[PDB]
Amino acid sequence: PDDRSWLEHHVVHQYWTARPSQFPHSLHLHSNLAAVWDQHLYSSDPLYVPDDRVLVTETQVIRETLWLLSGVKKLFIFQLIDGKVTVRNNIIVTHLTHSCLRSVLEQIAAYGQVVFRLQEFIDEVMGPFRTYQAFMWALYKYFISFKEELAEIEKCIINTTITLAIVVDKLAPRLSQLK
Amino acid sequence: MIHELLLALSGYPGSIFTWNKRSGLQVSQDFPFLHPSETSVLNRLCRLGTDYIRFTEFIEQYTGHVQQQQGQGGLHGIYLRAFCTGLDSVLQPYRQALLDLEQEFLGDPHLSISHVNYFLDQFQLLFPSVMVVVEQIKSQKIHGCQILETVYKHSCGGLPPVRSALEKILAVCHGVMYKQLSAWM
Amino acid sequence: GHREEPYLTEAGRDAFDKFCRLHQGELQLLAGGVLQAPQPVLVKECELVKDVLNVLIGVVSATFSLPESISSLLSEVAEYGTCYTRLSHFSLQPKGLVFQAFTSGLRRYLQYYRACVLSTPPTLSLLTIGFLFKKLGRQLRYLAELCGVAFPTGVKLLSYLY
């Protein structure tokens, strides 16, 4: 209302600021799959056990994962365990019933740890050796070019049909080099 | 976000980026209207303006403050002033870069923060490196010609942009010595 | 389609203004109405830029006469023109001969200061004016410390300046 209305419209605010997501849908199994399976589970008598996850949309995940992958840390998604990002099991998308998601988000979390530790290492040289200083400089010189390509993709998100398998495949020559 | 960020980075603290002398620039970080995703990129940007305000404060405080000066090199003397001049001239690309950012904000105000962050990542290494070079000289009460050596050892650096950037300050402080010796000899 | 919903770092130029308005209202609530913003937005940019071009000429601006971070930028460029006018007030004369020749040589520089403004910018960025007049406005505030803005006049000046 009047400022929260404008906020709710143009900015999102729905899992990471408390506002239960009423995102419209076309239901009918291909995008209703989590609900279809939950209703099936209840009809087979679990018994009861309501599963509570807070329902993020699809594209928001992909954008957040981009910002995770580029090299900046501390996002809302992905529970950290020591400084190791893992899959968040407190969110859910309208289909896939949180299992395929649990696999693929684990893959990107595996990449997120490798980039997290390297960027933390580079940060801890600025707070000599004459060889560590050149080493972090080479690592950094890679990272800036890598981060640039991620950032232009994230810019081009706002400017179409976005799903996982395009941005995953497009970043194959980057996650290969990351290993 | 559009003008506010450039205003913070130029060295005018606002009510979003609140100046302290113990924490420099700082986000308010108590609103649920901004979120952990943008927060981190913003803190990374806050560092540069904090160091910038320190730099400009020192330069202004000790250059153009007396006619031309008894004596302590960490507070007085021509050499400290010529240092501050060299430090101001190396900061000129920072001004030029911020100016270009405003042009892109004018071209489209819905461009990502990570683009800005990517632009300013090269200063992200350079500013903390020169900060300790100035901080050691002022803290240790370094007098006279030892200042020229202290910067010279830090122009043996293992970062090439930092090395060339400090070399320019060394060129200025050499210039004043050239100017004096040219009459003395 | 409805869009991809950009955040409050990329959805401004409208939510920027709403965010500033909300922040100002929040501060006024958190104080008690004892704070009183003078509307640091409206006027916009080009009108503001023309006003600060006018204060460097020697004539008074729209808040000073003898986004909220604009106040910090504004004070720094306002006190510049306040010094220029008080320097012309010190050079107001048609007595020591060398003192007169000194004052006329000062006015030969004040003319340069008047010539640099409004020959380079017609109207430009709000940051450009401060950056362009940083290496030069510092010289103008050096002149306030130099002059009397006891004090040497005449022969005393002829020795003191030498």
PDB file of C-alpha atoms in Angstrom, chain A residues 2-179:
ATOM      1  CA  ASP A   2       1.267   3.308  -1.506  1.00  0.00           C
ATOM      2  CA  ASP A   3       4.934   2.511  -0.894  1.00  0.00           C
ATOM      3  CA  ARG A   4       4.762  -1.156  -0.052  1.00  0.00           C
ATOM      4  CA  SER A   5       2.549  -1.450  -3.137  1.00  0.00           C
ATOM      5  CA  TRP A   6       5.284   0.052  -5.334  1.00  0.00           C
ATOM      6  CA  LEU A   7       7.878  -2.076  -3.532  1.00  0.00           C
ATOM      7  CA  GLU A   8       5.870  -5.305  -4.021  1.00  0.00           C
ATOM      8  CA  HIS A   9       5.380  -4.508  -7.708  1.00  0.00           C
ATOM      9  CA  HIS A  10       8.759  -3.487  -9.034  1.00  0.00           C
ATOM     10  CA  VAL A  11      11.034  -4.998  -6.440  1.00  0.00           C
ATOM     11  CA  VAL A  12      10.263  -8.545  -5.371  1.00  0.00           C
ATOM     12  CA  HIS A  13      10.252  -9.051  -1.550  1.00  0.00           C
ATOM     13  CA  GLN A  14       8.821 -12.561  -1.166  1.00  0.00           C
ATOM     14  CA  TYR A  15      11.052 -15.083   0.558  1.00  0.00           C
ATOM     15  CA  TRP A  16      13.834 -12.959   1.800  1.00  0.00           C
ATOM     16  CA  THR A  17      11.526 -10.300   3.179  1.00  0.00           C
ATOM     17  CA  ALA A  18       8.533 -11.964   4.816  1.00  0.00           C
ATOM     18  CA  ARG A  19       5.697 -11.864   2.306  1.00  0.00           C
ATOM     19  CA  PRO A  20       4.144 -15.268   1.403  1.00  0.00           C
ATOM     20  CA  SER A  21       4.415 -15.624  -2.350  1.00  0.00           C
ATOM     21  CA  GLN A  22       1.118 -15.528  -4.218  1.00  0.00           C
ATOM     22  CA  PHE A  23       2.577 -16.072  -7.656  1.00  0.00           C
ATOM     23  CA  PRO A  24      -0.026 -16.873 -10.329  1.00  0.00           C
ATOM     24  CA  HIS A  25       0.086 -20.194 -12.109  1.00  0.00           C
ATOM     25  CA  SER A  26      -1.483 -22.207 -14.937  1.00  0.00           C
ATOM     26  CA  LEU A  27      -1.401 -25.395 -12.725  1.00  0.00           C
ATOM     27  CA  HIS A  28      -1.884 -28.656 -14.732  1.00  0.00           C
ATOM     28  CA  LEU A  29       0.967 -31.036 -13.944  1.00  0.00           C
ATOM     29  CA  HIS A  30       3.909 -29.721 -16.069  1.00  0.00           C
ATOM     30  CA  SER A  31       4.244 -26.737 -13.722  1.00  0.00           C
ATOM     31  CA  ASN A  32       2.073 -27.967 -10.794  1.00  0.00           C
ATOM     32  CA  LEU A  33       4.233 -31.010 -10.109  1.00  0.00           C
ATOM     33  CA  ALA A  34       5.252 -30.378  -6.502  1.00  0.00           C
ATOM     34  CA  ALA A  35       1.600 -29.818  -5.581  1.00  0.00           C
ATOM     35  CA  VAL A  36       0.514 -32.880  -7.593  1.00  0.00           C
ATOM     36  CA  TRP A  37       3.019 -35.053  -5.762  1.00  0.00           C
ATOM     37  CA  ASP A  38       2.155 -33.597  -2.359  1.00  0.00           C
ATOM     38  CA  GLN A  39      -1.534 -34.297  -2.950  1.00  0.00           C
ATOM     39  CA  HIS A  40      -0.585 -37.814  -4.044  1.00  0.00           C
ATOM     40  CA  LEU A  41       1.490 -38.263  -0.888  1.00  0.00           C
ATOM     41  CA  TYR A  42      -1.413 -37.124   1.302  1.00  0.00           C
ATOM     42  CA  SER A  43      -3.930 -39.316  -0.512  1.00  0.00           C
ATOM     43  CA  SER A  44      -1.690 -42.336   0.030  1.00  0.00           C
ATOM     44  CA  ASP A  45      -1.743 -41.385   3.774  1.00  0.00           C
ATOM     45  CA  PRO A  46       1.819 -40.273   4.791  1.00  0.00           C
ATOM     46  CA  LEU A  47       0.490 -39.806   7.672  1.00  0.00           C
ATOM     47  CA  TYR A  48       0.066 -35.958   7.708  1.00  0.00           C
ATOM     48  CA  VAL A  49       3.645 -34.508   8.010  1.00  0.00           C
ATOM     49  CA  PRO A  50       3.242 -31.058   6.380  1.00  0.00           C
ATOM     50  CA  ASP A  51       6.469 -30.113   4.572  1.00  0.00           C
ATOM     51  CA  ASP A  52       7.284 -26.431   5.072  1.00  0.00           C
ATOM     52  CA  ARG A  53       9.291 -24.607   2.430  1.00  0.00           C
ATOM     53  CA  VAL A  54       8.666 -21.006   1.490  1.00  0.00           C
ATOM     54  CA  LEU A  55       8.317 -21.115  -2.349  1.00  0.00           C
ATOM     55  CA  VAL A  56      10.761 -18.995  -4.419  1.00  0.00           C
ATOM     56  CA  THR A  57      10.098 -18.452  -8.134  1.00  0.00           C
ATOM     57  CA  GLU A  58      12.294 -19.902 -10.850  1.00  0.00           C
ATOM     58  CA  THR A  59      14.266 -16.995 -12.328  1.00  0.00           C
ATOM     59  CA  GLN A  60      15.170 -15.504  -8.952  1.00  0.00           C
ATOM     60  CA  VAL A  61      17.154 -18.623  -8.122  1.00  0.00           C
ATOM     61  CA  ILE A  62      19.092 -18.399 -11.393  1.00  0.00           C
ATOM     62  CA  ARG A  63      19.980 -14.742 -10.869  1.00  0.00           C
ATOM     63  CA  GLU A  64      21.095 -15.369  -7.263  1.00  0.00           C
ATOM     64  CA  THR A  65      23.218 -18.286  -8.383  1.00  0.00           C
ATOM     65  CA  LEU A  66      24.904 -16.056 -10.948  1.00  0.00           C
ATOM     66  CA  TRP A  67      25.893 -13.593  -8.218  1.00  0.00           C
ATOM     67  CA  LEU A  68      27.126 -16.522  -6.174  1.00  0.00           C
ATOM     68  CA  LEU A  69      29.192 -17.907  -9.051  1.00  0.00           C
ATOM     69  CA  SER A  70      30.883 -14.650 -10.085  1.00  0.00           C
ATOM     70  CA  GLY A  71      32.911 -14.324  -6.931  1.00  0.00           C
ATOM     71  CA  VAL A  72      30.985 -12.187  -4.488  1.00  0.00           C
ATOM     72  CA  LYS A  73      29.867 -13.897  -1.298  1.00  0.00           C
ATOM     73  CA  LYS A  74      27.007 -13.580   1.242  1.00  0.00           C
ATOM     74  CA  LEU A  75      23.674 -14.158  -0.515  1.00  0.00           C
ATOM     75  CA  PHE A  76      20.340 -15.126   1.087  1.00  0.00           C
ATOM     76  CA  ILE A  77      20.034 -18.530  -0.642  1.00  0.00           C
ATOM     77  CA  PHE A  78      22.449 -21.421   0.227  1.00  0.00           C
ATOM     78  CA  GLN A  79      22.890 -22.205   3.911  1.00  0.00           C
ATOM     79  CA  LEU A  80      26.611 -22.032   4.696  1.00  0.00           C
ATOM     80  CA  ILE A  81      28.133 -24.642   7.002  1.00  0.00           C
ATOM     81  CA  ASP A  82      31.567 -23.177   7.770  1.00  0.00           C
ATOM     82  CA  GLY A  83      31.932 -20.941   4.852  1.00  0.00           C
ATOM     83  CA  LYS A  84      30.776 -23.790   2.655  1.00  0.00           C
ATOM     84  CA  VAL A  85      27.618 -23.050   0.726  1.00  0.00           C
ATOM     85  CA  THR A  86      25.259 -26.002   0.485  1.00  0.00           C
ATOM     86  CA  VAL A  87      21.810 -26.455  -1.028  1.00  0.00           C
ATOM     87  CA  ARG A  88      18.982 -24.722   0.847  1.00  0.00           C
ATOM     88  CA  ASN A  89      16.246 -27.214   1.755  1.00  0.00           C
ATOM     89  CA  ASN A  90      13.862 -24.509   2.983  1.00  0.00           C
ATOM     90  CA  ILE A  91      12.772 -23.291  -0.474  1.00  0.00           C
ATOM     91  CA  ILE A  92      10.804 -24.959  -3.256  1.00  0.00           C
ATOM     92  CA  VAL A  93       9.868 -24.312  -6.908  1.00  0.00           C
ATOM     93  CA  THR A  94       6.452 -25.036  -8.476  1.00  0.00           C
ATOM     94  CA  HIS A  95       7.549 -28.272 -10.136  1.00  0.00           C
ATOM     95  CA  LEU A  96      10.466 -30.767  -9.836  1.00  0.00           C
ATOM     96  CA  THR A  97       9.253 -31.575  -6.225  1.00  0.00           C
ATOM     97  CA  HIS A  98      12.662 -30.454  -4.684  1.00  0.00           C
ATOM     98  CA  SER A  99      14.703 -33.537  -5.642  1.00  0.00           C
ATOM     99  CA  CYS A 100      16.140 -32.764  -9.082  1.00  0.00           C
ATOM    100  CA  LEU A 101      16.617 -29.287  -7.610  1.00  0.00           C
ATOM    101  CA  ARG A 102      18.536 -30.777  -4.691  1.00  0.00           C
ATOM    102  CA  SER A 103      20.901 -32.418  -7.175  1.00  0.00           C
ATOM    103  CA  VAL A 104      21.539 -29.511  -9.522  1.00  0.00           C
ATOM    104  CA  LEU A 105      21.809 -26.869  -6.797  1.00  0.00           C
ATOM    105  CA  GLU A 106      24.343 -29.147  -5.172  1.00  0.00           C
ATOM    106  CA  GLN A 107      26.380 -29.055  -8.402  1.00  0.00           C
ATOM    107  CA  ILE A 108      26.439 -25.264  -8.447  1.00  0.00           C
ATOM    108  CA  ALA A 109      27.181 -25.244  -4.704  1.00  0.00           C
ATOM    109  CA  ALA A 110      30.211 -27.427  -5.453  1.00  0.00           C
ATOM    110  CA  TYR A 111      31.395 -24.708  -7.813  1.00  0.00           C
ATOM    111  CA  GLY A 112      30.507 -22.025  -5.282  1.00  0.00           C
ATOM    112  CA  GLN A 113      32.832 -23.493  -2.690  1.00  0.00           C
ATOM    113  CA  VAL A 114      35.806 -23.529  -5.065  1.00  0.00           C
ATOM    114  CA  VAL A 115      35.278 -19.889  -5.942  1.00  0.00           C
ATOM    115  CA  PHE A 116      34.558 -18.933  -2.271  1.00  0.00           C
ATOM    116  CA  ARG A 117      37.846 -20.292  -0.971  1.00  0.00           C
ATOM    117  CA  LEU A 118      39.949 -18.732  -3.751  1.00  0.00           C
ATOM    118  CA  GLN A 119      38.412 -15.273  -3.346  1.00  0.00           C
ATOM    119  CA  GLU A 120      38.876 -15.493   0.425  1.00  0.00           C
ATOM    120  CA  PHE A 121      42.512 -16.414  -0.155  1.00  0.00           C
ATOM    121  CA  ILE A 122      42.995 -13.402  -2.428  1.00  0.00           C
ATOM    122  CA  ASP A 123      41.317 -11.128   0.154  1.00  0.00           C
ATOM    123  CA  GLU A 124      43.644 -12.334   2.888  1.00  0.00           C
ATOM    124  CA  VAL A 125      46.736 -11.089   1.006  1.00  0.00           C
ATOM    125  CA  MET A 126      45.513  -7.475   1.176  1.00  0.00           C
ATOM    126  CA  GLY A 127      44.326  -7.994   4.749  1.00  0.00           C
ATOM    127  CA  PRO A 128      56.639  -9.669   1.282  1.00  0.00           C
ATOM    128  CA  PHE A 129      56.930 -13.038  -0.445  1.00  0.00           C
ATOM    129  CA  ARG A 130      57.361 -11.681  -4.031  1.00  0.00           C
ATOM    130  CA  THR A 131      55.852 -14.902  -5.394  1.00  0.00           C
ATOM    131  CA  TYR A 132      52.541 -15.187  -3.526  1.00  0.00           C
ATOM    132  CA  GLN A 133      51.900 -11.601  -4.630  1.00  0.00           C
ATOM    133  CA  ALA A 134      52.327 -12.522  -8.291  1.00  0.00           C
ATOM    134  CA  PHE A 135      50.327 -15.728  -7.779  1.00  0.00           C
ATOM    135  CA  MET A 136      47.226 -13.995  -6.412  1.00  0.00           C
ATOM    136  CA  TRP A 137      47.642 -11.425  -9.192  1.00  0.00           C
ATOM    137  CA  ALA A 138      47.435 -14.140 -11.855  1.00  0.00           C
ATOM    138  CA  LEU A 139      44.415 -15.713 -10.075  1.00  0.00           C
ATOM    139  CA  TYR A 140      42.791 -12.292  -9.893  1.00  0.00           C
ATOM    140  CA  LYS A 141      43.566 -11.542 -13.541  1.00  0.00           C
ATOM    141  CA  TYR A 142      41.609 -14.659 -14.461  1.00  0.00           C
ATOM    142  CA  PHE A 143      38.781 -13.786 -12.072  1.00  0.00           C
ATOM    143  CA  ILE A 144      38.076 -10.333 -13.494  1.00  0.00           C
ATOM    144  CA  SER A 145      37.538 -11.673 -17.025  1.00  0.00           C
ATOM    145  CA  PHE A 146      35.416 -14.535 -15.686  1.00  0.00           C
ATOM    146  CA  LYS A 147      33.308 -12.189 -13.555  1.00  0.00           C
ATOM    147  CA  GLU A 148      32.768  -9.887 -16.557  1.00  0.00           C
ATOM    148  CA  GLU A 149      31.113 -12.598 -18.647  1.00  0.00           C
ATOM    149  CA  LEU A 150      28.881 -13.622 -15.778  1.00  0.00           C
ATOM    150  CA  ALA A 151      27.863  -9.999 -15.218  1.00  0.00           C
ATOM    151  CA  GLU A 152      26.951  -9.358 -18.849  1.00  0.00           C
ATOM    152  CA  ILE A 153      24.765 -12.470 -18.817  1.00  0.00           C
ATOM    153  CA  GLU A 154      23.009 -11.180 -15.684  1.00  0.00           C
ATOM    154  CA  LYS A 155      22.489  -7.855 -17.451  1.00  0.00           C
ATOM    155  CA  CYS A 156      20.999  -9.688 -20.437  1.00  0.00           C
ATOM    156  CA  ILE A 157      18.509 -11.484 -18.163  1.00  0.00           C
ATOM    157  CA  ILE A 158      16.417  -8.330 -17.731  1.00  0.00           C
ATOM    158  CA  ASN A 159      16.630  -7.503 -21.434  1.00  0.00           C
ATOM    159  CA  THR A 160      13.233 -13.450 -22.501  1.00  0.00           C
ATOM    160  CA  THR A 161      12.842 -17.201 -22.019  1.00  0.00           C
ATOM    161  CA  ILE A 162      15.228 -18.168 -19.204  1.00  0.00           C
ATOM    162  CA  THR A 163      15.566 -21.646 -17.733  1.00  0.00           C
ATOM    163  CA  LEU A 164      18.399 -23.652 -16.228  1.00  0.00           C
ATOM    164  CA  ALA A 165      19.715 -25.632 -19.160  1.00  0.00           C
ATOM    165  CA  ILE A 166      20.718 -22.600 -21.232  1.00  0.00           C
ATOM    166  CA  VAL A 167      22.739 -20.792 -18.592  1.00  0.00           C
ATOM    167  CA  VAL A 168      24.261 -24.057 -17.387  1.00  0.00           C
ATOM    168  CA  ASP A 169      25.389 -25.057 -20.889  1.00  0.00           C
ATOM    169  CA  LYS A 170      26.587 -21.542 -21.695  1.00  0.00           C
ATOM    170  CA  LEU A 171      28.891 -21.568 -18.666  1.00  0.00           C
ATOM    171  CA  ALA A 172      30.435 -24.962 -19.430  1.00  0.00           C
ATOM    172  CA  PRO A 173      33.751 -23.426 -20.653  1.00  0.00           C
ATOM    173  CA  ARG A 174      33.837 -21.391 -17.435  1.00  0.00           C
ATOM    174  CA  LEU A 175      33.029 -24.078 -14.873  1.00  0.00           C
ATOM    175  CA  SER A 176      35.497 -26.307 -16.717  1.00  0.00           C
ATOM    176  CA  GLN A 177      38.246 -23.731 -16.264  1.00  0.00           C
ATOM    177  CA  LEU A 178      37.172 -23.256 -12.644  1.00  0.00           C
ATOM    178  CA  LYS A 179      38.002 -26.887 -11.809  1.00  0.00           C
TER     179      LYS A 179
END
